[PDB]
Amino acid sequence: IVGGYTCGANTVPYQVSLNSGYHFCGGSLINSQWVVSAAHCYKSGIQVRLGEDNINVVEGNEQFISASKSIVHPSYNSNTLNNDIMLIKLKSAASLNSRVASISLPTSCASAGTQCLISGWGNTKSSGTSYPDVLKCLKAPILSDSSCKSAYPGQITSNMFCAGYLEGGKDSCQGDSGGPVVCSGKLQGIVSWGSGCAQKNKPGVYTKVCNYVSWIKQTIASN
Ligand SMILES: NC(=[NH2+])c1ccc2[nH]c(-c3cc([C@@H](CC(=O)[O-])C(=O)[O-])cc(Br)c3[O-])nc2c1
Ligand SMILES: [Ca+2]
Ligand SMILES: [Cl-]
């Protein structure tokens, strides 16, 4: 996250860290046995880390659980990143409490101007790499479809939306992929891609979760 702030320990209880010997992507806890992340974060040997704040120090509240299976959307296109969503089922359910909690899926999609909270342990530099130890936060508004397509002509599908600042300086970045975009207590997006990080007129692009609620429900119900 570039231009964000330190969230504060366990203030984002649905945020998870996908780990393979190091943090490589974020995710969101939607119930005690399933996590939603981005398809492009897929890999084998994933350990999901819940109740984290500093990812390099065991401070207490952490629950490390192996992924039993990862289900990448069947129509995921790695070239356009269309349908960039993945569900991970945990080997054992997580103990939920105030520090580890799930986030609600939306019933409707959000409108432009809605203010959301984006979080993650991704790079904090737009020009260079600086990874934080603790979770960073950023409040960002959803932009209009016209501004989004103007910024990324021919690359935005109906399953994506832009959130951020056209002036540059505040954005999600590498390491934040797969993590949550929460607006009014509902998971509306998944950090997906962008051109560099926090560059002017190049906002972040997120997977539009409201378009996938039935898929998620059906898939969880049959696995
Ligand atoms: N500006 C943004 N809003 C943004 C958001 C998520 C991103 N995730 C990534 C991302 C980048 C890589 C690198 C690979 C590298 O530098 O070694 C790449 O350019 O392909 C890899 C992953 Br996996 C990402 O999620 N970039 C991102 C940029
Ligand atoms: Ca820790
Ligand atoms: Cl277009």
Beta bridge partner(s), residue 50: 63
Q: CB of 28 within 8 A of CB of 15?
A: yes
Beta bridge partner(s), residue 205: 162, 193
Beta bridge partner(s), residue 77: 82
Beta bridge partner(s), residue 101: none
Place of tokens 């002509």: 153
For 122, phi then psi, to 5°, come to -80, 175
**Cβ contacts of 33 within 8 Å, gap of 6 or more:** 89, 90, 92, 93, 94
Cα–Cα dist 42/9, whole Å: 27
Q: Give the determination technique.
A: X-ray
Domains in the chain, please, with CATH? 1-12+103-210 (2.40.10.10), 13-102+211-223 (2.40.10.10)
Residue 199 burial (CB count, 10 A): 16
Cα–Cα dist 118/198, whole Å: 14
Instruction: Please report the sign of the dihedral spanned by the C-alpha atoms of residue 178, residue 184, residue 188, residue 191.
Output: negative
Both tokens assigned to 85: 């969503």
Cα–Cα dist 85/121, whole Å: 19
Pocket lining for ligand 1, CB < 6 angstroms: 40-41, 171-174, 176-177, 191, 193-194, 197, 204
Q: How far is the CA of 193 from the centre of ligand 3 (A)?
A: 17
Cα–Cα dist 110/189, whole Å: 10
Beta bridge partner(s), residue 65: 48
Amino acid present at 91: K
Q: CB of 199 within 8 A of CB of 168?
A: yes
Q: Resolution in angstroms, to 1 decimal, for this deposition?
A: 1.5
> For the residues of 39-88, what is the DSSP string, one character each?
GGG--SS-EEEES-SSTTS--S--EEEEEEEEEE-TT-BTTTTBT--EEE
Counting ligands in written order, the one closest to the CA of 170 is 1
